[PDB]
């Protein structure tokens, strides 16, 4: 078969838009390399979660993974800006904030230099909404709600600041937790709610619109070093096409999925978001205290972009 047998790990499962785009990536790479590269895919946290996988890219033990810009906060806390709730208004602002600002370029350089990882392309992974086993009519209904979050500082802070009881748990554990009422809710973009069938086990959806997720196609520098230049170019080009498809999948899913969910019996609320935004405002201050002048710059540059 192939000269290069590469591995691509992800948290998302095999019915997800992420998996659809990663399968497209693997196909494009096999075709354009003339069969010289073959890509195996390990979804559903088969290799661990995304923190483990990012570490495996760093260590040269895994070739590819997906990760949010914001996830880099586990190494470079200033990256948290990408996840601060209600701070980034759309994908265009997120992508330009990473690629076209001095802050973002500085962060990409650190990732390459210190973590041994290159960003191949940037995709949209949806805006997070809140499912539950009780109606969320306003921020008041968050109070004491047992809200699963991923194992991520910003989602923990979101739950805390709205009044909820944050319960961190790996993605792979969520469906059972919802089904059994071990937690009262969780929070994820619409397409994820569909792919994991969380709508099967949650009677309610609230459009809290709280955190916008991007999605980085990541490659280990050890992988790039293992590939000849012309196959490096194949990989880079394929990642560019896959990200565009990935983003389209999420945009078209978001535009359609509330109606789908209603048709499956889900009750869909639209709480006033003004008090959600006000509740999180002070967490921006925590960010600024933790990250100093780099943090300040990040927020100014995003503000300027959002203004366009
Ligand atoms: C690239 C990646 O693995 N994204 C995953 C994210 C991030 O881990 C989290 O947003 C913190 O960055 O968590 C999920 O939304 C979740 O567990 O609910 C699953 C999703 O597949």
Numbering used by the authors: 2 to 309
In the authors' words:
The first step of this process is the transport of sialic acid to the cytoplasm, which often takes place using a tripartite ATP-independent transport system consisting of a periplasmic binding protein and a membrane transporter. In this paper, the structural characterization of periplasmic binding proteins from the pathogenic bacteria Fusobacterium nucleatum, Pasteurella multocida and Vibrio cholerae and their thermodynamic characterization are reported. The structure and the thermodynamics of the binding of sugars suggest that all of these proteins have a very well conserved binding pocket and similar binding affinities.
Pm-SiaP and Fn-SiaP were crystallized together with Neu5Ac. Their structures were determined to 1.57 and 2.5 Å resolution, respectively. The structure of Pm-SiaP was refined to an R factor of 0.17 and a free R factor of 0.20, and that of Fn-SiaP was refined to an R factor of 0.21 and a free R factor of 0.25. Superposition of the structures of the Neu5Ac-bound forms of the proteins resulted in an r.m.s. deviation of the 301 Cα atoms of between 0.4 and 0.6 Å. All three proteins (Pm-SiaP, Fn-SiaP and Hi-SiaP) have very similar structures, distinguished by two domains on either side of a well defined pocket, within which Neu5Ac binds. In all of the Neu5Ac-bound structures, a consistent pattern was seen in how Neu5Ac interacts with four of the residues within the pocket. Similar inter­actions between these four residues and Neu5Ac exist in Hi-SiaP and Pm-SiaP, with minor differences in sequence numbering (e.g. Arg127 and Arg147 are involved in the first two interactions in Hi-SiaP), as also seen previously. Thus, it was interesting that the SiaPs of F. nucleatum and P. multocida bound both forms of SA with equal affinity, and that there was only a moderate decrease in the binding of Neu5Gc in the case of V. cholerae.
